[PDB]
Ligand binder design. Structure first.
Ligand SMILES: Nc1ncnc2c1ncn2[C@@H]1O[C@H](COP(=O)(O)OP(=O)(O)O)[C@@H](O)[C@H]1O
Ligand SMILES: [Mg+2]
Length: 253
DNA sequence: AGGGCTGATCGTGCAAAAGTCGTGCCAGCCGTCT
């Protein structure tokens, strides 16, 4: 329920991912719009020997301070003013374990070439402490597929990405998943009802279930969660079965 | 019974005002030649 039940093909892929988890090889990952490819990564990291090691996942390419790539390894403060440099860094935080990337999609072509070169050769040096790169323990990249690079060539510098052919993982649509979708929805509903402290599950008309099934699920299980939330809030009661399920909060009446 | 406040610990720069040096150069004088 709170874990990744996953479809049958998704189950086989999950087995493959849990296996590749011990493989600390650098990776680039792809999940759907609202599939949630992160939880499988956490399950793998637990399955990886890097489970004990730190697994700092990239913070969506956040742009705090001017260190930027030197945010990967920087200094804290001059001794005369403040505190010691104390060797704190971003590329260093994921120490002894996994290292996950996020919001890799948003980048332009220049930083794309930079990342490609870092893959080719990586060094970490900071005014404050730091430690040698070229380790990148259990490295894995994610969220790049949200914005494709060089799809028709051009865009970001993904020619090297074509050259850099470390293994990748696709993402089938939720509509194409054909898993226990109603079961996952029920699990989410029960979790919400507990969170909502609801009297009980009011129920759902199987006709309502089939009607809600008439949807592309563009946000995948995230779309499922949002639609369930809207449908339940519309129900707002535990009395009678939900003959209504939320198509879209954007509408009129 | 409730608040405050405390300080364990927090080091290799450089700038501020100020001077001092570079450099010349103007006033006087006496050796001189007038
Ligand atoms: N098979 C699954 N097992 C557990 N949780 C899931 C599953 N599929 C989707 N989810 C949920 O969907 C949400 C998607 O969130 P997010 O990670 O932003 O999606 P994406 O990775 O597509 O951006 C996650 O919070 C996750 O809890
Ligand atoms: Mg996401």
């Amino acid at each position: 329920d709170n874990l990744l039940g996953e479809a049958n093909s998704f189950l086989e892929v999950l087995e493959q991912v849990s296996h590749l988890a011990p493989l600390d090889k650098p990776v680039l990952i792809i999940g759907e719009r609202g599939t949630g490819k992160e939880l499988i990564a956490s399950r793998l990291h637990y399955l990886s020997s890097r489970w004990q090691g730190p697994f700092i996942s990239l913070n969506c390419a956040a742009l705090n301070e001017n260190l930027l790539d030197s945010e990967l390894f920087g200094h804290e403060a001059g001794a005369f003013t403040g505190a010691q440099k104390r060797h704190p860094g971003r590329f260093e935080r994921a120490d002894g374990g996994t290292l996950f990337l996020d919001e890799l999609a948003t980048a332009p072509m220049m930083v794309q070439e930079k990342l490609l070169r870092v893959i080719e050769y990586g060094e970490l040096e900071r005014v404050g402490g730091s430690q040698p790169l070229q380790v990148n323990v259990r490295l894995v990249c994610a969220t790049n597929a949200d914005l494709p690079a060089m799809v028709n060539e051009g865009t970001f510098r993904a020619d090297l990405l074509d050259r850099l052919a470390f293994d990748v993982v696709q993402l089938p649509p939720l509509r194409e998943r054909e898993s226990d979708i109603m079961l996952m929805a029920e699990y989410f509903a029960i979790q919400m009802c507990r969170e909502i402290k609801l009297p009980l599950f009011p129920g759902f008309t199987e006709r309502a279930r089939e009607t809600l099934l008439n949807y592309r699920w563009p946000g995948n299980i995230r779309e499922l969660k949002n639609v369930v939330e809207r449908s339940v809030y519309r129900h707002g009661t535990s009395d009678y079965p939900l003959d209504d399920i939320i198509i879209d909060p954007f509408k009129r009446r």
